[PDB]
């Protein structure tokens, strides 16, 4: 009755963008990125990859309510390092890791029987 439509977990509404970037208050070179219509699949993977880059000082994600499919990502980088470039390199490093994962599976799949 009151329950919202199930596509709102992944379907952006009117006037909603996927990302919203806002500068952090009382935190130098830090930013808060509001990811819309996503969940722990993306947030935990982006955050763990931001930890592997040794020029990133802070990386954390949080879902402020399970009702709404969205989360916030906070990144803080070194001086002279845009966190968007840290987000870009982290996202791209995810794709190249998944690219090799897809190729190595298809290699091992065709080697098999049944």
């Amino acid at each position: 009755m009151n329950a919202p439509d199930r596509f709102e977990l992944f379907l952006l509404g009117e006037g909603e963008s996927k990302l919203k970037i806002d500068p952090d208050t009382k935190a130098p070179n830090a930013v808060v990125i509001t990811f819309e219509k996503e969940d722990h699949t993306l947030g935990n993977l982006i955050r763990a990859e931001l930890l592997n880059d040794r020029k990133v000082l802070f990386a954390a994600y949080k879902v402020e309510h399970p009702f709404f499919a969205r989360f916030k990502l906070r990144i803080q980088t070194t001086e002279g390092y845009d966190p968007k470039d840290a987000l870009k390199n982290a996202c791209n490093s995810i794709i190249n890791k998944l690219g090799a994962l897809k190729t190595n599976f298809e290699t091992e799949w065709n080697l098999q029987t049944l």
Partner: peptide
């Protein structure tokens, strides 16, 4: 699992296009 990998990296690639 392959479409699992591919849909996963498609979700990450949409963030690059969003940026």
């Amino acid at each position: 699992v392959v479409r699992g990998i591919d849909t996963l990296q498609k979700k990450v690639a949409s963030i690059l296009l969003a940026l």
